[PDB]
Design a protein around this ligand. Structure first.
Ligand SMILES: [Ca+2]
Ligand SMILES: [Ca+2]
Length: 110
């Protein structure tokens, strides 16, 4: 992890803006504005690990209400409608969690 060094602080500054709403979590456009899909697959491992505070290897509603705190400060509390839709979109597998390889490619569906 290290959401500045691995990625780009400027791109992150735009990205935290691209989620600066209640429910309007355009993950596809965040992952574009932050340059994520332009960084390495092995960078995308260090990406996911910044959101998975637990280091349990899976992100779920407890973290996913404020996942932005791994992207940077000024993050805030996401809406109850957001977390519901975001877990249901971000779990491509059917296990109810965001996994890294899903999250990387979930946004390539753009
Ligand atoms: Ca977790
Ligand atoms: Ca999954």
């Amino acid at each position: 992890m290290s959401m500045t060094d691995l990625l780009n602080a400027e791109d992150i500054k735009k990205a935290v803006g691209a989620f600066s709403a209640t429910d309007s979590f355009d993950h596809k456009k965040f992952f574009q504005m932050v340059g994520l899909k332009k960084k390495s697959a092995d960078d995308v491992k260090k990406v996911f690990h910044m959101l998975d505070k637990d280091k349990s290897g899976f992100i779920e509603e407890d973290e996913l209400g404020f996942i932005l705190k791994g992207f940077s400060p000024d993050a805030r509390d996401l809406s109850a409608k957001e977390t519901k839709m975001l877990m249901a979109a971000g779990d491509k597998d059917g296990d109810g969690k965001i996994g890294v390889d899903e999250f990387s490619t979930l946004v390539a569906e753009s």
